[PDB]
């Protein structure tokens, strides 16, 4: 709108750190994927998947 | 029972217990609480949450 | 002592006697505590591999 905000903002620079472990590395989805040979249950994280 | 409390050894490779049948049963790190209680599963997924 | 000796004695045990104790003349039979035909599970229970 262009309306002033009723309240006053605390605006002021600072440095934030870009942390590691991003998202596109942490998403996970299964659905009839590979399975162990001995137990015949689903594999663990990673692989594919 | 690899180690039936007698001092047998049961070394197969590099003097290391011979993976017995009783080992798998009550691991942990095996069935019991990993293949019968809490099983992975499929048709699932996870990721970071957001508001 | 020995096993062959024990088993023999058990097998002789009287039927009305096998029940007198916490045994089962149908499911559990002392004369069974001794192995003779050791069974062999199918690979399905075991593992393999191939480099």
PDB file of C-alpha atoms in Angstrom:
ATOM      1  CA  UNK A   1       0.000   0.000   0.000  1.00  0.00           C
ATOM      2  CA  UNK A   2       2.546   2.714   0.907  1.00  0.00           C
ATOM      3  CA  UNK A   3       1.012   3.073   4.307  1.00  0.00           C
ATOM      4  CA  UNK A   4       3.568   3.839   6.970  1.00  0.00           C
ATOM      5  CA  UNK A   5       3.759   0.997   9.414  1.00  0.00           C
ATOM      6  CA  UNK A   6       2.251   1.911  12.786  1.00  0.00           C
ATOM      7  CA  UNK A   7       5.317   0.471  14.496  1.00  0.00           C
ATOM      8  CA  UNK A   8       8.922   1.391  13.957  1.00  0.00           C
ATOM      9  CA  UNK A   9      11.252  -1.203  12.548  1.00  0.00           C
ATOM     10  CA  UNK A  10      14.654  -2.133  13.869  1.00  0.00           C
ATOM     11  CA  UNK A  11      16.423  -2.188  10.577  1.00  0.00           C
ATOM     12  CA  UNK A  12      20.183  -2.583  10.616  1.00  0.00           C
ATOM     13  CA  UNK A  13      22.844  -4.641   8.792  1.00  0.00           C
ATOM     14  CA  UNK A  14      24.520  -7.665  10.199  1.00  0.00           C
ATOM     15  CA  UNK A  15      26.222 -10.674   8.758  1.00  0.00           C
ATOM     16  CA  UNK A  16      24.515 -13.976   8.666  1.00  0.00           C
ATOM     17  CA  UNK A  17      26.330 -17.201   7.997  1.00  0.00           C
ATOM     18  CA  UNK A  18      25.295 -19.459   5.071  1.00  0.00           C
ATOM     19  CA  UNK A  19      25.104 -22.752   7.012  1.00  0.00           C
ATOM     20  CA  UNK A  20      25.834 -26.092   5.310  1.00  0.00           C
ATOM     21  CA  UNK A  21      23.437 -28.910   4.791  1.00  0.00           C
ATOM     22  CA  UNK A  22      21.109 -27.350   2.244  1.00  0.00           C
ATOM     23  CA  UNK A  23      17.669 -28.743   1.393  1.00  0.00           C
ATOM     24  CA  UNK A  24      18.089 -30.396  -1.984  1.00  0.00           C
ATOM     25  CA  UNK A  25      20.431 -32.772  -0.160  1.00  0.00           C
ATOM     26  CA  UNK A  26      18.037 -33.575   2.688  1.00  0.00           C
ATOM     27  CA  UNK A  27      14.776 -34.439   0.814  1.00  0.00           C
ATOM     28  CA  UNK A  28      13.970 -38.146   0.703  1.00  0.00           C
ATOM     29  CA  UNK A  29      11.238 -40.239  -0.937  1.00  0.00           C
ATOM     30  CA  UNK A  30      10.666 -43.997  -1.090  1.00  0.00           C
ATOM     31  CA  UNK A  31       8.250 -46.253  -2.969  1.00  0.00           C
ATOM     32  CA  UNK A  32       9.056 -49.893  -3.732  1.00  0.00           C
ATOM     33  CA  UNK A  33      12.810 -49.301  -3.690  1.00  0.00           C
ATOM     34  CA  UNK A  34      15.652 -51.812  -3.412  1.00  0.00           C
ATOM     35  CA  UNK A  35      15.895 -54.025  -0.322  1.00  0.00           C
ATOM     36  CA  UNK A  36      18.534 -55.899   1.699  1.00  0.00           C
ATOM     37  CA  UNK A  37      19.305 -59.425   0.655  1.00  0.00           C
ATOM     38  CA  UNK A  38      19.437 -61.057   4.084  1.00  0.00           C
ATOM     39  CA  UNK A  39      16.415 -59.455   5.698  1.00  0.00           C
ATOM     40  CA  UNK A  40      14.615 -58.424   2.508  1.00  0.00           C
ATOM     41  CA  UNK A  41      13.493 -55.129   4.045  1.00  0.00           C
ATOM     42  CA  UNK A  42      14.165 -51.655   2.683  1.00  0.00           C
ATOM     43  CA  UNK A  43      17.742 -50.300   2.415  1.00  0.00           C
ATOM     44  CA  UNK A  44      18.986 -47.368   4.495  1.00  0.00           C
ATOM     45  CA  UNK A  45      19.282 -43.668   3.686  1.00  0.00           C
ATOM     46  CA  UNK A  46      21.113 -42.676   0.513  1.00  0.00           C
ATOM     47  CA  UNK A  47      21.667 -45.216  -2.266  1.00  0.00           C
ATOM     48  CA  UNK A  48      18.561 -44.747  -4.413  1.00  0.00           C
ATOM     49  CA  UNK A  49      16.948 -44.253  -2.216  1.00  0.00           C
TER      50      UNK A  49
ATOM     51  CA  UNK B   1      26.663 -69.432  21.149  1.00  0.00           C
ATOM     52  CA  UNK B   2      29.991 -67.984  20.011  1.00  0.00           C
ATOM     53  CA  UNK B   3      30.873 -67.193  23.626  1.00  0.00           C
ATOM     54  CA  UNK B   4      29.062 -69.585  25.967  1.00  0.00           C
ATOM     55  CA  UNK B   5      31.294 -68.330  28.780  1.00  0.00           C
ATOM     56  CA  UNK B   6      33.973 -71.006  28.514  1.00  0.00           C
ATOM     57  CA  UNK B   7      36.859 -69.440  26.609  1.00  0.00           C
ATOM     58  CA  UNK B   8      36.497 -71.084  23.189  1.00  0.00           C
ATOM     59  CA  UNK B   9      37.408 -68.197  20.879  1.00  0.00           C
ATOM     60  CA  UNK B  10      35.421 -69.162  17.781  1.00  0.00           C
ATOM     61  CA  UNK B  11      37.870 -67.238  15.599  1.00  0.00           C
ATOM     62  CA  UNK B  12      37.128 -67.458  11.874  1.00  0.00           C
ATOM     63  CA  UNK B  13      39.109 -64.549  10.431  1.00  0.00           C
ATOM     64  CA  UNK B  14      41.707 -62.574  12.385  1.00  0.00           C
ATOM     65  CA  UNK B  15      40.633 -64.103  15.692  1.00  0.00           C
ATOM     66  CA  UNK B  16      37.121 -62.664  15.702  1.00  0.00           C
ATOM     67  CA  UNK B  17      33.938 -64.283  17.030  1.00  0.00           C
ATOM     68  CA  UNK B  18      32.141 -66.379  14.411  1.00  0.00           C
ATOM     69  CA  UNK B  19      28.825 -64.656  13.692  1.00  0.00           C
ATOM     70  CA  UNK B  20      26.564 -67.162  15.442  1.00  0.00           C
ATOM     71  CA  UNK B  21      22.788 -67.580  15.213  1.00  0.00           C
ATOM     72  CA  UNK B  22      22.144 -66.235  18.711  1.00  0.00           C
ATOM     73  CA  UNK B  23      23.969 -63.049  17.731  1.00  0.00           C
ATOM     74  CA  UNK B  24      21.465 -62.051  15.043  1.00  0.00           C
ATOM     75  CA  UNK B  25      18.425 -62.778  17.207  1.00  0.00           C
ATOM     76  CA  UNK B  26      19.152 -60.581  20.229  1.00  0.00           C
ATOM     77  CA  UNK B  27      21.702 -58.146  18.824  1.00  0.00           C
ATOM     78  CA  UNK B  28      21.004 -55.493  19.185  1.00  0.00           C
ATOM     79  CA  UNK B  29      22.124 -54.199  15.788  1.00  0.00           C
ATOM     80  CA  UNK B  30      19.866 -56.815  14.213  1.00  0.00           C
ATOM     81  CA  UNK B  31      16.373 -58.290  14.309  1.00  0.00           C
ATOM     82  CA  UNK B  32      14.432 -58.181  17.582  1.00  0.00           C
ATOM     83  CA  UNK B  33      14.589 -54.389  17.840  1.00  0.00           C
ATOM     84  CA  UNK B  34      15.327 -53.537  14.212  1.00  0.00           C
ATOM     85  CA  UNK B  35      13.685 -56.167  12.022  1.00  0.00           C
ATOM     86  CA  UNK B  36      10.582 -57.018  14.056  1.00  0.00           C
ATOM     87  CA  UNK B  37       9.714 -53.951  16.154  1.00  0.00           C
ATOM     88  CA  UNK B  38      10.946 -50.896  14.263  1.00  0.00           C
ATOM     89  CA  UNK B  39      11.096 -51.605  10.539  1.00  0.00           C
ATOM     90  CA  UNK B  40      12.064 -48.914   8.031  1.00  0.00           C
ATOM     91  CA  UNK B  41       9.254 -49.052   5.472  1.00  0.00           C
ATOM     92  CA  UNK B  42       8.450 -47.542   2.074  1.00  0.00           C
ATOM     93  CA  UNK B  43       5.971 -45.139   0.475  1.00  0.00           C
ATOM     94  CA  UNK B  44       7.356 -42.418   2.731  1.00  0.00           C
ATOM     95  CA  UNK B  45       9.604 -39.376   2.695  1.00  0.00           C
ATOM     96  CA  UNK B  46      10.840 -36.468   4.754  1.00  0.00           C
ATOM     97  CA  UNK B  47      12.399 -33.060   4.441  1.00  0.00           C
ATOM     98  CA  UNK B  48      12.926 -29.753   6.169  1.00  0.00           C
ATOM     99  CA  UNK B  49       9.814 -28.000   7.415  1.00  0.00           C
ATOM    100  CA  UNK B  50       8.817 -24.407   6.793  1.00  0.00           C
ATOM    101  CA  UNK B  51       6.017 -22.159   7.991  1.00  0.00           C
TER     102      UNK B  51
ATOM    103  CA  UNK C   1      29.962 -88.939  30.892  1.00  0.00           C
ATOM    104  CA  UNK C   2      28.695 -88.574  27.325  1.00  0.00           C
ATOM    105  CA  UNK C   3      25.682 -87.855  25.102  1.00  0.00           C
ATOM    106  CA  UNK C   4      24.965 -91.240  23.514  1.00  0.00           C
ATOM    107  CA  UNK C   5      24.635 -92.584  27.056  1.00  0.00           C
ATOM    108  CA  UNK C   6      22.232 -89.894  28.260  1.00  0.00           C
ATOM    109  CA  UNK C   7      19.980 -90.060  25.201  1.00  0.00           C
ATOM    110  CA  UNK C   8      19.694 -93.838  25.559  1.00  0.00           C
ATOM    111  CA  UNK C   9      18.565 -93.468  29.174  1.00  0.00           C
ATOM    112  CA  UNK C  10      16.001 -90.829  28.208  1.00  0.00           C
ATOM    113  CA  UNK C  11      14.502 -92.868  25.368  1.00  0.00           C
ATOM    114  CA  UNK C  12      13.938 -95.592  27.963  1.00  0.00           C
ATOM    115  CA  UNK C  13      12.040 -93.150  30.175  1.00  0.00           C
ATOM    116  CA  UNK C  14       8.480 -94.343  30.792  1.00  0.00           C
ATOM    117  CA  UNK C  15       5.720 -92.531  28.891  1.00  0.00           C
ATOM    118  CA  UNK C  16       3.643 -91.841  31.990  1.00  0.00           C
ATOM    119  CA  UNK C  17       6.941 -90.547  33.318  1.00  0.00           C
ATOM    120  CA  UNK C  18       7.667 -88.138  30.443  1.00  0.00           C
ATOM    121  CA  UNK C  19       4.527 -86.269  31.490  1.00  0.00           C
ATOM    122  CA  UNK C  20       5.200 -86.470  35.233  1.00  0.00           C
ATOM    123  CA  UNK C  21       7.642 -83.639  34.534  1.00  0.00           C
ATOM    124  CA  UNK C  22       7.482 -80.363  32.622  1.00  0.00           C
ATOM    125  CA  UNK C  23       7.875 -82.288  29.373  1.00  0.00           C
ATOM    126  CA  UNK C  24       5.713 -83.029  26.332  1.00  0.00           C
ATOM    127  CA  UNK C  25       5.567 -86.581  24.977  1.00  0.00           C
ATOM    128  CA  UNK C  26       4.328 -84.874  21.812  1.00  0.00           C
ATOM    129  CA  UNK C  27       6.247 -81.605  21.481  1.00  0.00           C
ATOM    130  CA  UNK C  28       9.149 -81.644  23.940  1.00  0.00           C
ATOM    131  CA  UNK C  29      10.955 -84.926  24.603  1.00  0.00           C
ATOM    132  CA  UNK C  30      14.173 -84.999  26.647  1.00  0.00           C
ATOM    133  CA  UNK C  31      15.449 -87.538  24.113  1.00  0.00           C
ATOM    134  CA  UNK C  32      15.389 -84.532  21.784  1.00  0.00           C
ATOM    135  CA  UNK C  33      17.853 -82.367  23.711  1.00  0.00           C
ATOM    136  CA  UNK C  34      20.566 -84.306  21.881  1.00  0.00           C
ATOM    137  CA  UNK C  35      21.253 -83.524  18.223  1.00  0.00           C
ATOM    138  CA  UNK C  36      21.661 -86.306  15.661  1.00  0.00           C
ATOM    139  CA  UNK C  37      20.247 -85.049  12.360  1.00  0.00           C
ATOM    140  CA  UNK C  38      21.217 -81.396  12.789  1.00  0.00           C
ATOM    141  CA  UNK C  39      18.937 -79.557  10.351  1.00  0.00           C
ATOM    142  CA  UNK C  40      20.209 -77.214   7.631  1.00  0.00           C
ATOM    143  CA  UNK C  41      18.445 -73.913   6.901  1.00  0.00           C
ATOM    144  CA  UNK C  42      18.148 -72.780   3.271  1.00  0.00           C
ATOM    145  CA  UNK C  43      20.417 -70.055   1.862  1.00  0.00           C
ATOM    146  CA  UNK C  44      17.415 -67.720   2.056  1.00  0.00           C
ATOM    147  CA  UNK C  45      18.394 -67.465   5.721  1.00  0.00           C
ATOM    148  CA  UNK C  46      22.072 -67.029   4.849  1.00  0.00           C
ATOM    149  CA  UNK C  47      23.979 -64.553   2.666  1.00  0.00           C
ATOM    150  CA  UNK C  48      26.435 -64.614  -0.244  1.00  0.00           C
ATOM    151  CA  UNK C  49      28.091 -62.091  -2.561  1.00  0.00           C
ATOM    152  CA  UNK C  50      30.071 -61.765  -5.793  1.00  0.00           C
ATOM    153  CA  UNK C  51      32.815 -59.223  -6.482  1.00  0.00           C
TER     154      UNK C  51
END
